[PDB]
C-alpha cells in the first residue's frame, strides 16, 4: 500500500504548486542595487600547524575559537591578534567546534565519535575536560549550544541528538534522514533548528517534541552548509553543484537560486549579514564570493587565500567577517 | 604606547608560540598512514603483530605507533563507520601513503576488491597520494591451488590466454602454477593502477603473509621512495 505514500506525495506537490504566483525576482525588480563592495583584509592570524576545519565567534564579538587537524584549539583576541588559550586534544581528527553563549565552555568533536566539552573558568589556571558525551555510531560533524546545559549534535549516521550535560544522556533522538548529516543551525529564539544531509534534502525539527516538522527538497547533490536568515523565517543552503538556494518556512517553497556559469566548484560554508542584504559563501576555487540576497547578482569577491576556504562566520554586531582556509591562516575582513 | 596588562598579555602569547614551535618539530618528523581493507582481509593480524613485535564500544578511529631505524610512524584505521566513504576520506589528503590490504584466496569476493581499489585510486582528493598494496594470505592460495578442487578460470574468463611475465622471481622453489596465479592477480591490480596515473602517484605491490615479520621494513622502503620523489619535485630538479 505504498500507493498511499505516492498519492500523498503528489497531493503535497500540488498544494505547494498552487501557492506560487509571483517570484522574488519580480517583486524585487523595482529596488536599487547594492553596488560594488570592496572589503580589505585587516589582520592575519598565524600559529596553526595544519589545515583549519572550523571556527566560531563569541557573543561579545571579540573572541574567536578555531580547530585544526594537528590537535589544537586556539582562542584568539581579534582586536590585537594575541593568543589566550591553547587546548591540546586527545584525538587529532577534529571536524567541528562551538563556543558557548555565556562564554564559559567550548566544544569539539570529530572522527572519534565523541563530543568533548571544555571548561574555561576554573580556580586552577588550566583548561580541563568537563565531560565526554558518547552514544553516536559515526563521526560528529556539527555541534551547537542552546544554553550552558544543553547541546545539539549531528552525526555521520543519519541521526541528530540533544544531550543533557550534567547527566550525560540523550533526552531526544531525531531520526528520518537517509544520508550523512553535515550541518546545523539554530533559530534565534531557540525553539527550532534545521539540518542538511547528503540525500539532497533539509528538515526543520521541533526541539521540545522531537518530531520532524517539514521537509524541503532540491539541490541534485550533497548539502554542505546551512544557515538561518536573521528574521527566523528563512534559511539558505550550499551544495556540491555550485549553487545556493533560499527556502522559506511558511510558504514551504524555494525562492531564489544563486549560480553562475564560471563557477564549477562546490560551496563549503554559508553565512548571512546582520540585516539579510548580503549572502556570503565560500568555494573550493580558493575564493569567497559575496551575493546580493534579494537580486541574485554578485556584489564582490574576497580573494586572499592559497587553498580551499573551509569556514566562514559573521560577528553578532556586523563589524567583521572571518574566514579560514586549508593554508592554515585566518583573515579578518572589513 | 600600551599599558601594563597588555604587556603581560603579549608575554603570554609569545610563550604560547614557543610551545607551538616545539610541537611543529615533533610533527614534521612523523609520517602518517591510513589502513584500508575489507572484513576478510587480515589487517587485524597485521596490526596486532606489528604492535607486539615493536615497543570504548562505538569508538571510531584507532592508533598505532611503531618505529623503524629511529623513524616514527602513525597508522590509523576506522572502526565504527558506515558503508559510505566519500565524505570522511577528505581528511586524509596529506598523509604519506595509503596501505591497502586484499585477501587473495577468496576468488568470489575479489571483484568487489578490485572495484574498491578503483574507487580509491581515482578519487578527486587523493591525487598525489601513493598506495602500498599487500596481497595477503599467500599460503592459503597455495593450498587452494595445490588441492585442485576449486578452479580459477571459471570466475575469470581471460585466465587461459595468460602466461607468466618474463621478469618473475619465484624465490624458494615451488610449483609454477601458484606463480602463474599470483602474478595474474597482481596484474589485474596493476592494470587498474596504470590506466590513468599521469605521473603524479605510484603503486607499490607486495606479496605477504599475515604472520611474517618483514612488513615494517617494506613500509619503510616505500615511504623512503615516496618522500624522495616529493623532494625531487620541490627542490626544482624535475
Amino acid at each position, epitope marked *: 500500500l505504498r500507493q498511499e505514500a505516492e498519492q500523498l506525495k503528489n497531493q503535497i506537490r500540488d498544494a505547494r504548486k498552487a501557492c506560487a504566483d509571483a517570484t522574488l525576482s519580480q517583486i524585487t525588480n523595482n529596488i536599487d542595487p547594492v553596488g560594488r563592495i570592496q572589503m580589505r583584509t585587516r589582520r592575519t592570524l598565524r600559529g596553526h600547524l595544519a589545515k583549519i576545519y572550523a571556527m566560531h565567534w563569541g557573543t561579545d564579538s*571579540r*573572541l574567536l575559537v578555531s580547530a585544526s587537524q594537528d590537535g589544537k584549539l586556539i582562542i584568539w*583576541d581579534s582586536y590585537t591578534t*594575541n593568543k*589566550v588559550h591553547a587546548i591540546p586534544l586527545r584525538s587529532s581528527w577534529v571536524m567541528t567546534c562551538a563556543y558557548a553563549p555565556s562564554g564559559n565552555y567550548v566544544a569539539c568533536g570529530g572522527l572519534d565519535n565523541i563530543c568533548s566539552i571544555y571548561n574555561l573558568k576554573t*580556580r*586552577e*589556571g*588550566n583548561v580541563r575536560v568537563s565531560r565526554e558525551l558518547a552514544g553516536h555510531t559515526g563521526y560528529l560533524s556539527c555541534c551547537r549550544f542552546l544554553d550552558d546545559n544543553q547541546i545539539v549534535t549531528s552525526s555521520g549516521d543519519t541521526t541528530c541528538a540533544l544531550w543533557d550535560i550534567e547527566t550525560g544522556q540523550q533526552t531526544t533522538t531525531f531520526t528520518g534522514h537517509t544520508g550523512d548529516v553535515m550541518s546545523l543551525s539554530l533559530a534565534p529564539d531557540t525553539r527550532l533548528f534545521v539540518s542538511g544531509a547528503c540525500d539532497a534534502s533539509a528538515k526543520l525539527w521541533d526541539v521540545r517534541e522531537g518530531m520532524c516538522r517539514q521537509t524541503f527538497t532540491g539541490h541534485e547533490s550533497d548539502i554542505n552548509a546551512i544557515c538561518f536568515f536573521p528574521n527566523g523565517n528563512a534559511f539558505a543552503t550550499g551544495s556540491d553543484d555550485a549553487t545556493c538556494r533560499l527556502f522559506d518556512l511558511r510558504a514551504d517553497q524555494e525562492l531564489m537560486t544563486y549560480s553562475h556559469d564560471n563557477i564549477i566548484c562546490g560551496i563549503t560554508s554559508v553565512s548571512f549579514s546582520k540585516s539579510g542584504r548580503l549572502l556570503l559563501a565560500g568555494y573550493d576555487d580558493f575564493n569567497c564570493n559575496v551575493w546580493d540576497a534579494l537580486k541574485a547578482d554578485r556584489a564582490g569577491v574576497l580573494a586572499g587565500h592559497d587553498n580551499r576556504v573551509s569556514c566562514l562566520g559573521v560577528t553578532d554586531d556586523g563589524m567583521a567577517v572571518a574566514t579560514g582556509s586549508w593554508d592554515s591562516f585566518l583573515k579578518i575582513w572589513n | 604606547t600600551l*599599558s*601594563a*596588562e*597588555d604587556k*603581560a*598579555a603579549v*608575554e*603570554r602569547s609569545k*610563550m604560547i608560540e614557543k610551545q607551538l614551535q616545539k610541537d611543529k618539530q615533533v610533527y614534521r618528523a612523523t609520517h602518517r598512514l591510513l589502513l584500508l581493507g575489507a572484513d576478510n582481509s587480515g589487517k587485524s593480524t597485521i596490526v596486532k603483530q606489528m604492535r607486539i613485535y615493536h615497543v570504548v564500544k562505538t569508538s571510531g578511529i584507532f592508533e598505532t605507533k611503531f618505529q623503524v631505524d629511529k623513524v616514527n610512524f602513525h597508522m590509523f584505521d576506522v572502526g565504527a563507520q558506515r558503508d559510505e566513504r566519500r565524505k570522511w576520506i577528505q581528511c586524509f589528503n596529506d598523509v604519506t601513503a595509503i596501505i591497502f590490504v586484499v585477501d587473495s584466496s577468496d576468488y568470489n569476493r575479489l571483484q568487489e576488491a578490485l572495484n574498491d581499489f578503483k574507487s580509491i585510486w581515482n578519487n578527486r582528493w587523493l591525487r598525489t597520494i601513493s598506495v602500498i598494496l599487500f596481497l595477503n594470505k599467500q599460503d592459503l592460495l597455495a593450498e587452494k591451488v595445490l588441492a585442485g578442487k576449486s578452479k580459477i578460470e571459471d570466475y575469470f574468463p581471460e585466465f587461459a590466454r595468460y602466461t607468466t611475465p618474463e621478469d618473475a622471481t619465484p624465490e624458494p622453489g615451488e610449483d609454477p602454477r601458484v606463480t602463474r596465479a599470483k602474478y595474474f592477480i597482481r596484474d589485474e591490480f596493476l592494470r587498474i593502477s596504470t590506466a590513468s596515473g599521469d605521473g603524479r602517484h605510484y603503486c607499490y605491490p607486495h606479496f605477504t603473509c599475515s604472520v611474517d615479520t618483514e612488513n615494517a621494513r617494506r613500509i619503510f622502503n616505500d615511504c623512503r621512495d615516496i618522500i624522495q620523489r616529493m623532494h625531487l619535485r620541490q627542490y626544482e630538479l624535475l
Partner: single-chain antibody, 232 residues
Framework: VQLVESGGGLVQPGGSRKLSCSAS????????MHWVRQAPEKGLEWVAY????????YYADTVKGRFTISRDDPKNTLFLQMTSLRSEDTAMYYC??????????????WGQGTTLTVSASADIVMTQATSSVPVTPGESVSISCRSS???????????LYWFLQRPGQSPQLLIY???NLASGVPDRFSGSGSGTAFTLTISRLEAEDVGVYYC?????????FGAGTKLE
C-alpha cells in the same frame, strides 16, 4: 587552592634572610607572583613582581638593590632574598597570585603571611578620605576614593581595584578593574567612578562586613595603595 609560606623571626640589624612561599592546588607555572607587605599598624605597600617565564621582574624604590626575587617551577616554590635589612623593614609579608589575559582577574588569591621583626616622585598618589565611618546593620554606606592622574586608558579600561581585610585574616578581592564583582562575592557590593574620583557602595550591611577597605591602582609600576578606611 592554597599558598602557605614561611621564614622570619627576630633578627639582627645588618643581616640577611630568605623567604619562601609554597604553592599547591593550582597550575603555578602559568601565574605571576607578587610580594606585598604592611607595617604593624599602617597600610599595604608593594614589594616585587615576577612573571611566568621569569622574563620580567620589577622592584619598588625602597628595595631597588637590596632585595632579589626568584621562582622554582618544578619544585613549585617562590623565593625572596633580602640583604642588608634596616629597621624600616619590620612588616608582615604576603604571597599573592596574578594572571593576565583578556578578561582575567588579577590579585585573586592571597596567602596568610609571615611576620618579620627587625630589632633596633613622579608616581601616582591615591588618597582616602576621613578614615572612620560609624554604621548600624541594615543601612547603606558609600566609601570613597581619589586619585592624582587619570587612570582611564585609551583602551577604554579603568584600572582600579578594591580589597577587604577582616580582623582575623588576609585580604580578599571584591572589585577588579572598577566595575566587576570578583568570583564568590555577594551581589551586595558594587562600585563605580568617573575617571579620577571613585566610589564603592554597600547595599545592606551584614555582621561579617566590618573591616578596612583598601584601594589600588595598576596603570604603571610601582603600584600604590592608599591608607584605607575602617568600619565599626
Amino acid at each position: 587552592v592554597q599558598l602557605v609560606e614561611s621564614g622570619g623571626g627576630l633578627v639582627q640589624p645588618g643581616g640577611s634572610r630568605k623567604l619562601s612561599c609554597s604553592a599547591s592546588g593550582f597550575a603555578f607555572s602559568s601565574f605571576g607572583m607578587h610580594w606585598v607587605r604592611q607595617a604593624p599598624e599602617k597600610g599595604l605597600e608593594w614589594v616585587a613582581y615576577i612573571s611566568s617565564g621569569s622574563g620580567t621582574i620589577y622592584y619598588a624604590d625602597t628595595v631597588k638593590g637590596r632585595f632579589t626575587i626568584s621562582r622554582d617551577d618544578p619544585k613549585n616554590t617562590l623565593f625572596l632574598q633580602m640583604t642588608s635589612l634596616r629597621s624600616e623593614d619590620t612588616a608582615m609579608y604576603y604571597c599573592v597570585r596574578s594572571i593576565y589575559y583578556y578578561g582575567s582577574s588579577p590579585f585573586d588569591f592571597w596567602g596568610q603571611g609571615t611576620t618579620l621583626t627587625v630589632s633596633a616622585s613622579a608616581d601616582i598618589v591615591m588618597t582616602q578620605a576621613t578614615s572612620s565611618v560609624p554604621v548600624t546593620p541594615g543601612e547603606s554606606v558609600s566609601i570613597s576614593c581619589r586619585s592624582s592622574k587619570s587612570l582611564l586608558h585609551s583602551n577604554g579600561n579603568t584600572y582600579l581595584y578594591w580589597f577587604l581585610q577582616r580582623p582575623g585574616q588576609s585580604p580578599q578581592l571584591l572589585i577588579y578593574r572598577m566595575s566587576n564583582l570578583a568570583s564568590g562575592v555577594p551581589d551586595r557590593f558594587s562600585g563605580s567612578g568617573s575617571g579620577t574620583a571613585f566610589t564603592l557602595t554597600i547595599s545592606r550591611l551584614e555582621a561579617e562586613d566590618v573591616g578596612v577597605y583598601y584601594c589600588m591602582q595598576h596603570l604603571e609600576y610601582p603600584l600604590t595603595f592608599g591608607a584605607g578606611t575602617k568600619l565599626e
